[PDB]
């Protein structure tokens, strides 16, 4: 299951195993047609998804909850080495602009996803540690597990 890493005063780390070849996991983590099918929280399906996994690429995501209100984020792909590494910035609407790092290394069983998020300040890293973000992000991986298996 999902392991919290040590990180630092402005950095959060996560690691998770996935039963699939990194080539499949990368397609899941970067495709606009597959991301909506797993990366969402309870009652907030992904309604808009623009993802371009190449330097300078645009990232635009929007979730719509019950009642109609939205929540979204924009970011830019800084670099992309399929399938082992991807770096992009993220900015919702908060904390401040964040830099997210995804590293995919083959492990026995399938693939291990190492993720890191560098925050603006150490207090921005604060407000976020107090968010069911870790929780929601495991609920999402669980979704991803079911999708990989159904494939």
End-to-end CA distance of the chain: 20
Question: Is residue 26 a contact partner of residue 34, using CB atoms and an 8 Å limit?
Answer: no
Which method was used?
X-ray
CATH 3.30.530.20: does it fit domain 1-151?
A: yes
List Cβ neighbours of 130 (8 Å cut-off, separation of 6 or more).
none
Per the structure block, which two tokens stand in for 132?
A: 């069911």
Rounded alpha-carbon distances, angstroms, from residue 53 to 7, 31, 82, 91, 122: 25, 8, 9, 17, 29
Instruction: Please list the residues that pair with 91 across neighbouring strands.
Output: 74
Virtual CA dihedral for 101, 102, 106, 112, nearest 10 degrees?
Answer: 110
């Amino acid at each position: 299951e999902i392991q919290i890493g040590p990180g630092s005063a402005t950095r959060l780390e996560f690691r998770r195993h996935f039963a699939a070849t990194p080539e499949q996991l990368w397609a899941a983590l970067t495709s606009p047609a597959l991301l909506p099918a797993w990366l969402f929280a309870r009652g907030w399906p992904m309604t808009e998804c623009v993802f371009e996994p190449h330097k300078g690429g645009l990232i635009r995501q929007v979730w719509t909850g019950p009642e109609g209100r939205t929540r979204g984020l924009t970011g830019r792909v800084i670099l992309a080495e399929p399938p082992h590494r991807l770096i992009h910035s993220e900015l919702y609407d908060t904390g401040g602009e964040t830099l997210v790092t995804l590293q995919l290394l083959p492990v026995e069983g399938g693939t291990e996803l190492a993720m890191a998020v560098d925050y603006a300040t150490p207090e921005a890293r604060d407000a976020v540690a107090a968010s069911a973000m870790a929780t929601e992000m495991e609920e999402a991986y669980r979704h991803l597990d079911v999708m990989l298996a159904a494939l």
